[PDB]
Every structure is written in structure tokens, then in C-alpha cells.
Design a protein around this ligand. Sequence first.
Ligand SMILES: O=S(=O)(N[C@@H]1CCC[C@H](N2c3ccccc3Oc3ccccc32)[C@H]1O)c1ccc(OC(F)(F)F)cc1
Ligand SMILES: [Mn+2]
Ligand SMILES: [Mn+2]
Lengths: 296, 583, 361
Amino acid sequence: DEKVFTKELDQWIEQLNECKQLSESQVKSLCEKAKEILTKESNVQEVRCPVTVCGDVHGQFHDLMELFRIGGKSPDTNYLFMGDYVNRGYYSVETVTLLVALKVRYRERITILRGNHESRQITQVYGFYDECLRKYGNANVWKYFTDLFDYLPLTALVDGQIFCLHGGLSPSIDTLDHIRALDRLQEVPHEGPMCDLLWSDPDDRGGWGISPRGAGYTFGQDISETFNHANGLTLVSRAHQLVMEGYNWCHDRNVVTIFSAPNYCYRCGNQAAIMELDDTLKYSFLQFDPAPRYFL
Amino acid sequence: DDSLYPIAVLIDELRNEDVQLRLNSIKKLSTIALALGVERTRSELLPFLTDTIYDEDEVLLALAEQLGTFTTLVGGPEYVHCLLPPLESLATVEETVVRDKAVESLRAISHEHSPSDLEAHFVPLVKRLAGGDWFTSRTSACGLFSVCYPRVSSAVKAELRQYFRNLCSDDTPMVRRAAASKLGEFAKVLELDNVKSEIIPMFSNLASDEQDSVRLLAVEACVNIAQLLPQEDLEALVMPTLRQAAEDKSWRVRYMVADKFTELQKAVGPEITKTDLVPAFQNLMKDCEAEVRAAASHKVKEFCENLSADCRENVIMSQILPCIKELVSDANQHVKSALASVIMGLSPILGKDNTIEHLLPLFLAQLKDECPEVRLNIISNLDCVNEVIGIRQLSQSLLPAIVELAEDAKWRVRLAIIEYMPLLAGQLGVEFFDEKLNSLCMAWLVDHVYAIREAATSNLKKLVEKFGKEWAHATIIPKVLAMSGDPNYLHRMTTLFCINVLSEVCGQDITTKHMLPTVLRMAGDPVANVRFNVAKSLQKIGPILDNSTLQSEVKPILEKLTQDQDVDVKYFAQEALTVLSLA
Amino acid sequence: QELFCQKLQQCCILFDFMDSVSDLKSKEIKRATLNELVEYVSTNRGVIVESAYSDIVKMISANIFRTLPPSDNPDFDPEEDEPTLEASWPHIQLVYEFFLRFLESPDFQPSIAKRYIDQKFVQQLLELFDSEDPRERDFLKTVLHRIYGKFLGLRAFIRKQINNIFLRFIYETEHFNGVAELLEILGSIINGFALPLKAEHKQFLMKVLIPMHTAKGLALFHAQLAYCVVQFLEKDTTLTEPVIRGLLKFWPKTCSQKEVMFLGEIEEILDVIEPTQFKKIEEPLFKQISKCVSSSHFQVAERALYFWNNEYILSLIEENIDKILPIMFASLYKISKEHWNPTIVALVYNVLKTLMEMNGK
Ligand SMILES: O=S(=O)(N[C@@H]1CCC[C@H](N2c3ccccc3Oc3ccccc32)[C@H]1O)c1ccc(OC(F)(F)F)cc1
Ligand SMILES: [Mn+2]
Ligand SMILES: [Mn+2]
């Protein structure tokens, strides 16, 4: 009885590609199955060489369609997404629904990692809860999505050489084993190794610093070099931080920031970019511009 | 009662504390109203529903639309008057949506009211709504004059005219705006004498109102009055109004006139047009605002196309072209973006002798601008010049520019050039593009983006059938099979797709002769992506093959791939086997 | 002889150099002339006569009366605050200061100025309130306050214009951005009520100010609107029940950001209502607050729970025990769900304990 469900998920993906949200029960079942699938993944999800790394989207559905056009459709080309799909977007619901549907359908092909914005407090304060309420009239879909976010992996490691994560390094994390020991099944705390992994950002200063965002820490080139040498890593890929060029090298090419939300909030006007890793892990970048187009 | 009991729907099932339940009740009330009986219904339900409902937008709109749909359940065309007091009381509410829906339902049911019932209830209804103290009733009353004026007695309409005049002369801007907006619908009064006598002064005073919204609405509705074609009087009745409105300071009115220039010219006439609108258009296109100039540049094509064919060449060469130089050279970006997608439509009208001398330089200048969207719009409708200018004369000038810009940074420009190529390639010759435009196609096929590769594949599949299978088996087969030796899987999938996209057109011969070995060899790729994309393509190339080669070589390969470690490739192979009917 | 120079020097500034077009020493000359004339009229009193009024008002009209060109507003959030359309602010600032100083002159003659200041002048002055930059809107508000304090005969026309503007802003479109600068001056001038409340005065409140709470951009002027609304209660406590009922029936259940502001305005209003008048809305208000607290949203819940931090609110709550009945179920259900936020859990637990302090079930 799996073929009928495969067809149902395929037509769900088709409808979502048309910019049409799913029903409440459909979203509930899809989130249940996404939880059942993600519970088997480790904190440091292992990914193989052929893959495409992407930055933040933030509900920009049309820009996600443009990203797919530039990199290719989800079935064939593999993707590794580093989080952030909620709030600060008109079509956040359709974005998250399409992404979780592709994950459930092609768990092997596409990968997804949690972001700091994928948190009950952040989603409520920044307006994803508002979008869910407007589109469904209640908070059931929001509750399901926030419960699913708790199961999203925190970091990924492709080819055992390139470390991918949303935020950055943490002063309480020295080895990948420390990350594998953390308990991801919980809301993003206000501090600790998880919050640092989901909030940290590079820094031009040396040593550790206090993040101006009020959460996480700031790290310099020396910290990234030490982490890479202790973990045997070649490059630390991250997003979270907005960049004018979409992608940006820093810390002597030891850390790379990727941003896939072009013209962030229709004001930043920054370009978007994606990072492709071929069969032998050799990297390449592809830049693109935004897709052209009472109280009750 | 087979349905919900009467007393229940009356008192028990109308507990006004819950909004959702009462909304659903007012929505499904039709099932109970059709069973309660038309007599008892019109006797008790309407006054009860009118008195119990307090003031909530949801139930208000629900009752409004229900009463609008209950025109048939009332049981009698003469008793429809019972549905007028409720709609009237609902129209006096402050909210605009519910009152607009009520006015809509009223104008809809007015067509069913009998003459006696009409003259007895609809006239006093509008008289009472127009005389209301608040502005909402006055704004809702002006929406029923268009339907109640014609189908009433010949003596009462004379008073309806004065009532509408008084309503239009309100001391608030909302009523004035509503009157200016709905005058175009109410202007249809047939009696041209009374029009010219009493309406045109009201229109002139409305066009001179202090509020800009009223002015723009008046100059918009002016088309409904000009459609009468009073050419013998327009030069003195409406022409001065349009003149004094052209040189407007509120600028909004200028934009509204620009957006309605074509609809105006459609009825102003040819002589009045050539006399007044052409200078007016030339002055508007030279305005300081940006929206008016954008609209003028966008509608210049439709204006020139609908111009009299007596001597359009002289007037257009003397008036428009000497002025379009300032627009094409303007610093505005939206104006040029709108002008580029319409200027090319003027190539046939200017004649072959003058178009290639006047529009060609401006066209080339616009094609090489820094604005990407301008070039995109230009190349989008580039298929309108080949039918006017010879292929060789067009290639002498524009072919180098397009084949040079075909490699622009913006991928959308490349996609447009690709999807436009087929026609020009077929019109040039099979040898020209094969000897000169081969490197361009090769660069297109090796692009890292998937959209351009798919567009190139489509162009190839469209040209192969336009030139035959000889050029197929000769030139494109080796050049496409060579790309399969690249390290990037994104390039291998390109050839993997093109193989079957070409086999679906070539036939079984070339397929089983050259492509089948390639696709059955690519199945051994260590990368999972290639070795299930091979099955995805096998699902399509299958029917092309015969029954012999199938059981000869395609069956063992598929049976072996079915045992692959990955689940996705396994499911794809199973689906391919099912579609292939290899039981 | 010297009286002619005051009107002869205006011809130089008669025309405009246009900020968009490149200029030369001409703009500097205009700026210097204005900078000198402002100080001249500020330090030299008595030089203005009956004839100077016409010339100065004509110059002001020719200078400031002009609608803004097409303004671009891609994003609705005002966090950008980039006045790109306005570029001649340093120039119009001088004429604005000149007009403000002329109106503030102790020896002003409203009767002489009335010959030229008419309804059309008020209309041409009010249309400028749509300026994109607040540097112009605040000065326009100040000029309006001054002209209202000086010209009291046109108060009815000003009120009618404000009512029309608010009605247009409510229903037709929300493009008017100078609504806060008008609401604040309205709330400030309403404090001058020293006579019995007139029928029209009390009806305008319910017919304009109350229905304005349903606007989308209420967050831009919620404090001013709440102040103007509560200003009516301290003058007549009998009109509190209709206002509260209107605020309740216009509850924005589709936006929690507006729900928090509604709760704040309510808390700010209950400090004036009396218990005898509060009992008329006790039951529905508390039944609504129960559901509001049951919402699974943290800021709205914490704002609704902070009501236990005001002395007057505690007094109005402890006046009777029949109000905790609908709240007990909400408090008992709020502790089971929303476990990810222990702060609101502890808050509702403390509120339940406080309610239990008084003898009740
Ligand atoms: O300001 S309102 O919030 N109305 C709003 C204000 C303008 C926009 C809304 N609209 C609307 C109005 C005009 C044209 C198009 C519109 O597209 C809509 C589409 C779907 C829902 C609503 C609307 C309109 O509905 C209000 C409600 C009730 C009031 O009290 C009462 F009930 F009237 F007595 C007072 C004010
Ligand atoms: Mn982030
Ligand atoms: Mn982000």
C-alpha cells in the first residue's frame, strides 16, 4: 500500500509547486512521517560527495523556484539546505510544506538542517505564526511544524571533510563527537552548544566574542583553523548571516557563508548564491537574482 | 419537520453569542426556508431576521447574500417587496463591503420587481436612502438609480433625475466620489435632449471639483458619454473639459487620462483626434511625471495602429518620431522598459523604405542598452520583423547583434534567444546556422544552468524535424555523445535527456543503432544519480524499441538494476518494468 | 517709505529654483534672504501692516501649496524611514519657520488675515500632511495647532475635514501617512473641553475614533489613539460602556500584534471606569479575556496576565468573586498545554494563587 501513498506525495509535491498549500490533516500526516524519518538521523548527518549546498530562503517561494531552476529540480540533483524557512516571507507555509514533502519523498536526495528561526519563540515573534493563522485559521499547522522542527538535524558533514551547519562554532564544542552527544529533541535554548551552533557567526576579531544579536558567540580565523585541524575538516559552510554577494569567503577560506534569499525582505537587494560539490568534492558557486514576476 | 424544526431555527438555533455557529446557520438557512413554506416564510422569517440581527460583519454579509439569492424562494414576484426593508436596513451600515453587497443584491432583484411593486416600493426606498443623514446611506443610494430610472413611469423619472442631481451635490467627498464613479453607468438615459440640457453642466462642474479623485473619475467616465458620438457638438460640449483636464496639476488626473487615451480615441473621432489629441499626446509624452510618460509610451503602439489610414505616414513622421527620441533617450527605466515591448510593432506601418532607416538605429540602440529587461522585452517579440524585412537584409544588420548578445550574463536573455532561434534558423537556411551558429548552440548545451540546457534540447528537437534525420545522424549525434564523458553528473544527465528527446523523433533505427548502447552503458555509472536517471529515461525510450532487442539486452540490465542497494533506483526500475509490460 | 521694501524684497523669492535641477548662487541668495527675513520679523515687531498680509500669504501659498509627486512605497513597514522624495527640506524649513513665527506674533491680526485665509487655503494647507518625511508633518501639525488657537471660527470646518480624512483613511485606502500627527493634535486639543459634552462631540468619538482601531497600521499610532480615547473618559464616565463595547466587537482576532495593543489600551482605560459602571461589562469582558489568555501565544498571554500588577485593577477584581468562574477553567487548562514556555505557566499559576487568596470557588 506504499505505491498509493507515493502517488499521493507526488501529487502533493505537484500542487505545492503550483503555490498551493495543503490541508490541515495532510500537513499533520506529512509532519508525522517527517518526524518518523528524521528521528533516525544523527546530529551530524552524513552526506556523500554529490550535493548542492544552499543558504537561507525565509519563505521566498518564487526565489526558491528560481533556485531550483538554476540548480535543477529536486529529484535528480541532490541538495543540502542549511535551514531558515519561516517568517520574513509571504509564502513561508508553501515553502516549508514543499520542503518537508520533498524530504519525505526523497529522503536520500534532499537534506534539511534546522535553523535558529525554526523555533517556537522566533516563529511567533517574527510572524510565521501569523501566516499559519491567516492561512488555516488555527495554530494546529503551526504546532505540527514547530514539533517537527525539533527533529531537524543540527549539523551535517559531507565527505567527512566539509562541515555544514547553520550558525557556527561553539566554545563548548571541540569535536564532532560532542555534537553527536547533544540532545537535539528539544526547543532551541537561549544558550549552550546548540544555541551557539544555530546562532554563531564569523568574526574579524581574534578569539571568542559576544554576538551582537544577543545569542551565540563570534569566532575569528584562529578558532576556525583550530576546529578544522582538530576535526580534520577542509571547509566550514554556513548561512544565517546576510551577504551582498550571496556567497563570501572568510578566515583564509576556512569558513564560507552562503545566502540563498535574494533581495532579502525586498530591501537588502543582496544577491543569492548556491554551492555545488561535484563527484570529487570540488566546489563551485552559482549566483542568481530574484525571480521576476478589517478584523474579521 | 423533515428538516430542522421551525421553533428551533426561530429561537433555539439563533443564539447570537457564537459567531461561527450563527454564520453557518445563516448560510444553511436556505434548506429550512425552502421547507418552512413561502407564505409563513415571507410572513414571519423576514421581520424576525431583520429585528434580531444586531451588527456583525459575518452574519450581515451572510444575510445580505441569502436575501439576494432568495429572490426565488419568496414564492411570489409581487411579494418581493418584503425583501426590501431588510436590504435597506443593511445598506445603512457603516461597513462598505456589506453595503456594497446589499446594493448588488438590490440591483439584481430589481429586474424581477413588477411595475406596480417597483413604483410602489423601490422609488420610496431610494428616496429614503438618498435622504439619510449619514454618508453611507447616501453612497449606497446612488447605486440604484441606473436600474430604477428606465423601467419606471415617464412622470416619476423626471423626479428621479432631480433626486440624483441633489445626491451628487452632497457636502461630503465620499458621496461625490461615488457619484463621479457611477455616473458612467447612470449616464445611459437615452434622452439626449435632457442630457445636453441638464447633465453636461453637472459634468463640467464635476470635472472642476477641488478633489482630484472626483476629477479623475469624471475624466474616466467621460468615455461613457463620448460613446454617443456627438461629433457635431463635442467641439463645444466635452472638448473644453478634456482640454482643461489635460493640463492638470493634481497629476493623478493626467495618469488617468493616459490610461484611458485609447478608449477615448476610440470614440472621439478621426478629425477631432488629429486636431486635438495628437498635440495633447505630444505634450503629455513630454511631461515631467514618470507614470504618464510610461503609459503614453506603452499605448503609443495601440494609438498608431488605430489611426486613420488616409495619411498616417505624414502625421506620424512629423509628430511622433521627432518626439520619441526624447523618450527612448530618457533617463527613466520603466518608461524605456514599457516602450521597448511596443516600439517594434510599428515596423510595418512605417514602410520598408523608411522603417529600416528610422526605427533600425533606435532599435539597435535600445537592444544594446544596459537594462537587461529592455533587451529581454526586445528579443521576446523579435519575430515581427522577419515578415516585414527580407531575411538577408535583416541578417546584414540585426543578426550579428543578436548572435553576439546571445551570451549575455542574464540567463533569461539566453533562454529567449534560444526559444526564438527556430524560426530564424529555418528562415535563414540549413547551412548558414550549421556553419556559423554551431559554436553558439554548443555553448548553450554546456551551460551550468538546467533551464538553458532544456531550452537548447527543445530547440534541437524542433530543428531536427525541420531539417530531417540526415543532419541528425551526421552532426549532432557525436557532439551529444561526447558530452557524456564529463566529470560533472549535471552534464551527463544533459546527454541522457537529449538522447531520448531525440529518439522520440528520430525513430527505432537510429535509436537501436546508436543511442541504446550509450544508455545501457551509462547504467554502470557509480553515481546513483546517473544510474537511476538512466531508468527514468528508459521509462520513456522503451516504447521506441522493438520487442526483440528488449528481451535481448534491456531485460537483464533492468533485472540487475532492480537489485541495486538504493531504494529510489529500485522503485524507478520497478516502475519502468511495469510501464514496459515486461511481465 | 520703509514699508515698501518689505513687499518689494519678496519678488526675488517669488520664483523657485527647484532642488532637482542644478542651481548656482541663486539658491544661496534665496536662502540668505529667508534667513535674514526670519530674524528681521522675529526681532522687528510692528513693521507688518494691513497690506503686508496679502503679499506674505500669497508668497506662502505660491511656495508651499503643492501635492507630492508619485512616491514609491514597496514595503509597508516604516522601519526604513528614507525620505527619498523630499529633497528641498532645508529650503521649505525657512518658510515654515517664518510662518510659525508670524502666527506666534503677539500682535497678530486674525481679522485682517481672514480676508485671504479661507476654506480653500485650509484645504491647500491640509493636503500637504501627506508628506513622506515627518520633518514636514510635525511642522504642519504645529502650524495647524497655532492656526486653530488663533482662528477659532474655522474649528467646525477643520473638524469636518478631519472627519472626512479619517473616513477616507478607514474605508477607501490606508495611504494617508500623516494620521498620527493629526491624532496626537486631536487628543491634545480635546483636553480643552470645559463645557457640557455636546451631542455631536460625543457622537464623533464613537463614529470616527472607535472605528479607526481596525486599521492595518495601528501600530504606528496606537498610543496616540488610546490617549485620545481615554481623554474622553476622564471628562464623562458615562460614555465608557459604549466605547468598551465598540472596542470589544472590533477585536482583531487575526493579528496577535494588534491583540497585545488592544489589551494595553484596555488596561489603560480600566483605570478610569468605576465599579458600578464596570459591572455592566464585567461578565463579557472577563469571558473574552479567558479566551484571550487561552491563546497559545506568549506575549499576548503575558500582557493579559500583567493585569494583576495595577492597584486599581486588583481592587476592581476583588470587588466581587463572581468574575473568577470563567477564568478558573482557562487557568486550569492553560497549565496542561504550552509546556515549551514555563514562564507563562508560572505566571498563570501565580494568578490562580492570587485568585484563590480571596474566598472563592
Ligand atoms: O475599516 S473596516 O475594518 N472595513 C474594511 C476597511 C477597508 C478594507 C476592507 N475591505 C474592502 C473595502 C473596500 C474595498 C475592498 C475591500 O476589500 C475587502 C476584502 C475582503 C474583506 C474586506 C475588505 C473593509 O472591510 C470597518 C469594519 C466595521 C466597522 O463597523 C461597522 F461594522 F461598519 F459598523 C467599521 C470599520
Ligand atoms: Mn539564521
Ligand atoms: Mn536567516
